[PDB]
Amino acid sequence: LSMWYGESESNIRDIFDKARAAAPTVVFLDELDSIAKARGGDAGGASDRVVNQLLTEMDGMNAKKNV
Amino acid sequence: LGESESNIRDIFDKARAAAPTVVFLDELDSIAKARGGSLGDAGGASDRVVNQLLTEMDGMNAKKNV
Amino acid sequence: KKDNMLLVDDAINDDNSVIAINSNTMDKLELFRGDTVLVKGKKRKDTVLIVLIDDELEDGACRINRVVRNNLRIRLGDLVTIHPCPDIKYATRISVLPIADTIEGITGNLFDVFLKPYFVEAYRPVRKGDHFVVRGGMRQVEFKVVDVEPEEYAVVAQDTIIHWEGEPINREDEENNMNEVGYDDIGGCRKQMAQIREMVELPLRHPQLFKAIGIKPPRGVLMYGPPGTGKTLMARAVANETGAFFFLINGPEVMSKMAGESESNLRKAFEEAEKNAPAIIFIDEIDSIAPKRDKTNGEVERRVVSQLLTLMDGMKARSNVVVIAATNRPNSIDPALRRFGRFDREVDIGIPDATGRLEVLRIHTKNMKLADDVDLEALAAETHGYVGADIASLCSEAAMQQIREKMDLIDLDEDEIDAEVLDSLGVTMDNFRFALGNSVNVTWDDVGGLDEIKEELKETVEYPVLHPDQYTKFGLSPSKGVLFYGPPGTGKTLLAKAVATEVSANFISVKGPELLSMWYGESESNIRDIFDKARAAAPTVVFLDELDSIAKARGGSLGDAGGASDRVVNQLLTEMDGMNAKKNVFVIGATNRPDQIDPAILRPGRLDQLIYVPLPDENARLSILNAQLRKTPLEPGLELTAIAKATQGFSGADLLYIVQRAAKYAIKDSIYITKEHFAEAMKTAKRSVSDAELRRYEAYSQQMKASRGQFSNFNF
Amino acid sequence: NGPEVMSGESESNLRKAFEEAEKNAPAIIFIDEIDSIAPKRDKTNGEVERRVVSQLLTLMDGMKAR
Ligand SMILES: Nc1ncnc2c1ncn2[C@@H]1O[C@H](COP(=O)(O)OP(=O)(O)O)[C@@H](O)[C@H]1O
Numbered sequence: 001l002s003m004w005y006g007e008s009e010s011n012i013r014d015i016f017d018k019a020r021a022a023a024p025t026v027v028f029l030d031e032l033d034s035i036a037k038a039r040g041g042d043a044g045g046a047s048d049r050v051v052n053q054l055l056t057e058m059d060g061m062n063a064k065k066n067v
Numbered sequence: 068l069g070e071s072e073s074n075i076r077d078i079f080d081k082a083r084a085a086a087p088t089v090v091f092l093d094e095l096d097s098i099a100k101a102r103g104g105s106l107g108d109a110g111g112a113s114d115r116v117v118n119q120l121l122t123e124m125d126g127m128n129a130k131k132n133v
Numbered sequence: 134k135k136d137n138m139l140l141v142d143d144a145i146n147d148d149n150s151v152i153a154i155n156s157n158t159m160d161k162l163e164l165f166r167g168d169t170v171l172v173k174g175k176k177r178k179d180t181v182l183i184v185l186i187d188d189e190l191e192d193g194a195c196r197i198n199r200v201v202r203n204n205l206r207i208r209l210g211d212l213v214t215i216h217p218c219p220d221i222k223y224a225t226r227i228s229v230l231p232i233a234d235t236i237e238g239i240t241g242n243l244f245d246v247f248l249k250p251y252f253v254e255a256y257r258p259v260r261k262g263d264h265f266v267v268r269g270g271m272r273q274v275e276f277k278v279v280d281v282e283p284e285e286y287a288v289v290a291q292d293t294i295i296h297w298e299g300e301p302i303n304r305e306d307e308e309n310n311m312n313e314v315g316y317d318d319i320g321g322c323r324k325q326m327a328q329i330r331e332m333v334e335l336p337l338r339h340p341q342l343f344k345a346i347g348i349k350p351p352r353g354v355l356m357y358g359p360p361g362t363g364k365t366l367m368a369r370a371v372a373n374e375t376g377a378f379f380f381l382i383n384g385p386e387v388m389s390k391m392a393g394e395s396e397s398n399l400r401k402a403f404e405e406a407e408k409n410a411p412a413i414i415f416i417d418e419i420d421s422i423a424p425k426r427d428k429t430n431g432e433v434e435r436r437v438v439s440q441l442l443t444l445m446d447g448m449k450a451r452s453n454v455v456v457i458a459a460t461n462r463p464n465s466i467d468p469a470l471r472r473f474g475r476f477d478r479e480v481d482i483g484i485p486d487a488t489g490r491l492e493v494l495r496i497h498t499k500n501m502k503l504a505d506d507v508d509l510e511a512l513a514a515e516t517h518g519y520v521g522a523d524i525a526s527l528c529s530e531a532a533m534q535q536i537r538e539k540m541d542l543i544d545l546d547e548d549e550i551d552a553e554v555l556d557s558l559g560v561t562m563d564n565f566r567f568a569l570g571n572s573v574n575v576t577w578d579d580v581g582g583l584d585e586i587k588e589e590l591k592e593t594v595e596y597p598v599l600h601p602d603q604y605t606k607f608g609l610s611p612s613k614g615v616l617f618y619g620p621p622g623t624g625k626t627l628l629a630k631a632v633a634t635e636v637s638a639n640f641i642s643v644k645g646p647e648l649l650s651m652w653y654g655e656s657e658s659n660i661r662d663i664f665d666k667a668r669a670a671a672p673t674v675v676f677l678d679e680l681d682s683i684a685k686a687r688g689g690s691l692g693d694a695g696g697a698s699d700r701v702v703n704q705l706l707t708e709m710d711g712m713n714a715k716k717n718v719f720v721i722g723a724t725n726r727p728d729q730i731d732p733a734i735l736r737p738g739r740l741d742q743l744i745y746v747p748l749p750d751e752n753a754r755l756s757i758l759n760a761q762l763r764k765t766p767l768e769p770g771l772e773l774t775a776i777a778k779a780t781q782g783f784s785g786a787d788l789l790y791i792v793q794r795a796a797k798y799a800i801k802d803s804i805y806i807t808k809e810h811f812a813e814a815m816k817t818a819k820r821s822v823s824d825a826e827l828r829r830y831e832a833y834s835q836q837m838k839a840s841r842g843q844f845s846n847f848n849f
Numbered sequence: 850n851g852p853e854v855m856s857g858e859s860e861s862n863l864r865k866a867f868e869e870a871e872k873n874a875p876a877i878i879f880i881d882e883i884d885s886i887a888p889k890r891d892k893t894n895g896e897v898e899r900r901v902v903s904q905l906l907t908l909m910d911g912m913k914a915r
């Protein structure tokens with residue numbers, strides 16, 4: 001997570017790009033109660049963007065690259 | 068789940084924009100929960116969700132046919 | 134009255150360069166038959182013509198042919214100032230060009246044919262910008278004077294050199310002069326338009342008045358209101374009718390992410406506005422670039438705020454230039470921006486009333502022959518919530534839909550245009566009905582029974598709208614609040630819609646528990662927003678439902694929900710009758726439990742009408758069954774009396790359920806209404822109302838009747 | 850097309866295309882892939898995009914009946 005605009009999703013984007021590059025690999029997302037927080041008045045919609053970026057970067061997993 | 072009512076409002080706006088359509092609400096009990104009395108923040112959110120759904124479904128005339 | 138200004142009349146002398154005055158006008162102002170006179174009309178235009186004694190003219194107004202009349206942008210029955218100019222003298226050269234559509238077809242020597250005999254030996258007094266007409270060769274060509282050497286106006290003696298060219302530019306530069314907006318294109322904003330008009334034109338027409346009174350005029354107008362009202366149209370009309378330069382600055386356009394670039398753009402815009410002429414600056418959407426310097430986090434917004442405060446006030450800040458703003462919420466502006474010298478005048482351009490909406494309808498349907506039997510009263514009474522920018526889209530959609538529905542059989546100009554299709558064109562009433570279809574649909578007929586309740590509601594709603602002058606003669610304010618109570622499924626919402634539908638008011642129907650929130654202040658903010666949207670468009674009837682769920686007769690609960698109920702009740706008590714002006718607000722309540730209402734909203738002045746809506750009898754259910762089956766194909770063999778006799782305490786919701794089951798059986802038999810559908814639907818009744826609640830409502834009505842005691846005919 | 854308008858010459862290209870289409874005949878202009886020229890004006894941060902969007906706005910509005 002970063003305080004700037006776009007970097008908080010670009011970090012997940014290039015981490016998953018590094019995961020897709022060195023196939024196979026294992027991405028251990030430790031303590032998912034801070035990334036995949038329940039939605040439930042907010043701070044602007046940054047955790048929702050993080051969850052949406054993780055969902056659209058985790059849905060493009062076919063039989064290839066086997067992460 | 069004001070944003071929790073705005074979600075149902077613009078979902079039904081997307082429904083009425085592309086008329087005709089079918090809005091398949093899966094697992095209805097989780098949304099409605101028979102508002103009744105719960106007396107909490109979850110109860111208030113449930114009552115506001117149920118009132119939004121009722122006031123955005125009863126306003127459907129013979130036009131727009133959702 | 135100085136006799137030097139005259140009206141435009143029809144022309145006897147068919148010549149181009151000529152006007153006709155009467156002889157009693159000649160002795161009233163020394164001029165002659167050969168005298169060349171300068172005509173200066175509206176739109177800051179001019180022309181030169183020959184005066185000639187005309188007996189028929191009658192001194193008061195002058196005869197001028199349609200060509201002169203056109204160059205001055207006037208009509209038959211418009212005033213013009215006439216004055217002689219002999220300072221003008223014979224031309225050195227002239228620059229005329231034919232307008233394209235008047236020469237489509239022919240070619241060759243236009244000079245020898247048209248221009249040569251037209252100017253010959255007449256020494257016509259022409260002008261730059263003039264468009265004259267020459268008839269010959271079985272057609273009439275129109276040339277426009279593009280240039281003369283001897284100033285703006287000159288004469289065409291035989292020695293004068295006439296230069297015509299064959300690829301000229303004409304017509305397009307004139308229309309964009311006539312297409313300009315004006316004071317005749319503004320409707321409903323009469324008093325604020327006149328105030329803005331005088332505060333702009335009184336420095337510009339004559340600064341000697343402000344020199345004699347010894348004070349400087351205001352140089353700032355802050356316009357606020359709903360989006361789509363006509364504020365930038367009014368600003369453009371004032372900037373077009375006066376010799377200013379309308380420069381448009383947008384809010385989110387000028388703002389950027391580069392440091393020191395948006396302030397440079399604002400400085401460049403102010404230098405361009407101060408460089409050429411005394412102009413009018415219109416900065417649109419100023420609330421986006423005025424974040425009040427404390428709620429924002431960005432430095433660039435405070436920097437452009439400081440740039441605006443520096444450019445508006447300071448050492449040699451403004452030299453004869455006025456700025457205009459536009460916003461939706463005027464509270465999110467700086468107190469230094471809303472100061473004297475920057476935005477010293479705040480103008481409320483709100484939603485217009487019925488006569489202003491009719492004026493907008495009249496000025497928006499001016500350039501089209503619509504019909505003969507279209508009445509604008511229904512169009513001004515049914516569109517009760519139109520801001521003004523939707524009326525033009527309404528007329529455009531109707532004019533598009535009429536040609537769309539009138540082109541399915543007639544061809545679409547694929548081979549040749551037709552002569553009889555353009556005749557008898559225009560929109561009708563059903564086109565406007567389809568445009569309104571593209572906010573409830575009742576008119577005093579869908580409700581059944583309750584004749585004295587309908588009469589009382591019709592009186593106490595329709596009377597303060599129709600006769601304000603008689604109430605100012607009597608000097609009293611009318612009543613506002615009506616409260617309904619009784620069993621559910623009785624017709625309170627239908628009665629509210631039926632009493633709302635005949636006035637030119639809006640309808641804001643909000644629900645009880647659809648405003649309460651878990652946050653702090655959200656329900657009272659929603660109540661204040663509802664009342665602000667109600668009183669922001671007069672008149673407006675408010676339909677508050679579930680008063681037993683809203684009020685709860687606050688008392689003492691000792692909890693967070695109880696304190697929220699106390700704050701909601703106090704906010705409603707303040708918004709209904711508090712520190713307000715109560716212009717036009719019709720609060721109408723509808724509950725099913727009047728015992729749980731606090732004795733402060735039932736106080737007179739807020740909800741004084743304690744009207745009870747009882748259950749209908751059989752003679753009332755006959756009217757309900759006749760009112761629900763208005764447009765339905767009926768059978769002569771059905772008896773609605775036999776249906777109403779077997780009810781014995783049903784409700785309007787149950788009767789609507791019976792009608793809906795009959796319509797479902799009719800569409801099942803289809804995929805008129807028959808009697809066996811009603812015979813099989815009468816068995817599956819509901820009767821959702823029990824018996825003890827009727828006893829409770831009757832006891833409450835008897836207690837309300839017994840509270841009215843020691844009251845009689847009351848002889849004085 | 851969209852991104853073939855750049856090289857203060859994008860405004861000159863827009864004015865050139867509009868005056869060429871207005872000068873010859875009553876005709877039709879095809880602007881393919883408008884999402885490059887119009888960046889929705891809120892998520893963008895450039896200045897020549899704002900200038901070319903303002904130019905397209907004041908050139909599309911300045912079309913008369915003739
Ligand atoms: N008082 C009025 N008279 C005539 N037309 C109006 C009036 N008010 C608004 N309109 C129409 O509404 C449209 C939008 O108004 P305009 O002032 O241009 O922008 P805004 O939407 O900011 O008010 C205009 O095209 C104009 O024709």
Ligand SMILES: Nc1ncnc2c1ncn2[C@@H]1O[C@H](COP(=O)(O)OP(=O)(O)O)[C@@H](O)[C@H]1O
Pocket residue numbers: 579580581582620621622623624625626627757760761784785786787789
């Ligand atoms: N007098 C009446 N005439 C015609 N229809 C009625 C009458 N009374 C009730 N109805 C019908 O019953 C329904 C009652 O709905 P609503 O007004 O929302 O509930 P309530 O009557 O409890 O306020 C309406 O849809 C209306 O069509």
